[PDB]
């Protein structure tokens, strides 16, 4: 299918769509707008929010039910029925942390502020219960690579950004970092990627 | 398999999974706890949040990856991949929005503005999407139910506790909680379960 992926020129909610892709060697359109024509183009969808992807044509919205869609029946997906519902959960459970933040907030003061409540005051515990949950394992889920390391990984690089010293105390959790980092073709991406802050 | 819900003594979380349990027919104890007993119980989960199923003694979190993994397989999932990842959408948009009103806020004129300005703008602006989304159609997805009409009158359920006249001008969002509530499990299961305000 031909595959047209849109959204802010940011990794944000749409990285994780952008590793799944680099990963499946699947060719796809990456169009990144300017915040000045997002009026615009919000205008014409029918939830008027991004990411969105569309696929011949059809347009598909929400950046983890389209994950889902493409990490279906590969071996990104878990390898089980119970995998599959741990690799959601994981997922869930870091988009419930990252969905706190104010992103869209005008006040900037209100929006630091904010920012720096979570990232000092909430992040430290999430840092503990994923080490705690990944125990002994290689991944998160089971005995390989899971679309649940590639949002850690993405999540964790934007708390990376606003809170260098998150990890300090969390060696497994960075080794788990790296080992994405490490597989070629997202490596290969992230040597690509437009580099944005966020 | 043998399955164990725990949450506490209200519809809440929980409910997209009792709906979920009762239109499959499959059995379940619907374990629900008291506020005495929630600090020992948190104390033992990974993630220290409700609601969690134990299926033959293996704990699952995060309702929605729960809910998803309960429909596996079924025509409530969706049925094709592509209008898997539009029952996945919707659902998504719904949770989303119910994320935006501060359950736990404890002053009361704070909760109260917070609410009205939701049911405001907010809503109103959510209800013409999905009511233009779903059109003259009999269900959200496809031409059979999804979890995803289960969600949208869980949600709407709770949200009219707040404002009662929400849907007096969408009658097809209206339309499409009573085709929900009329399905024979679920009717039944409205029926029997406890009354709670949420
Ligand atoms: N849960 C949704 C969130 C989508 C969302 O709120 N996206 C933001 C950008 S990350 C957006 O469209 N903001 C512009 C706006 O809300 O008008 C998803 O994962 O796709
Ligand atoms: N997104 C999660 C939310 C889990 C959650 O925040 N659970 C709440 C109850 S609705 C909870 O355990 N709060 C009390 C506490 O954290 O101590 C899910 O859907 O399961
Ligand atoms: C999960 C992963 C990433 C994000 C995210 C959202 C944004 C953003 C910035 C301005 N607008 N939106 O940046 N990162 C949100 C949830
Ligand atoms: C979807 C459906 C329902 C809910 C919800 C969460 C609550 C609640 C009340 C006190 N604490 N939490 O009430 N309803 C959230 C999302």
Redesign the pocket.
Known sequence: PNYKLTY?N????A??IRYIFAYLDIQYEDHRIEQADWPEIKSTLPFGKIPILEVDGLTLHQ?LAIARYLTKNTDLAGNTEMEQCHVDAIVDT??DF??C?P??EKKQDVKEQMFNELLTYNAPHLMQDLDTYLGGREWLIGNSVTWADF?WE??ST?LLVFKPDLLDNHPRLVTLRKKVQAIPAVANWIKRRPQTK?
Chains 1, 2 share one sequence.
């Open positions: 802010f940011m990794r944000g909610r990285e994780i950046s870091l988009d990252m969905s933040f992103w869209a949002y993405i999540c934007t966020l």
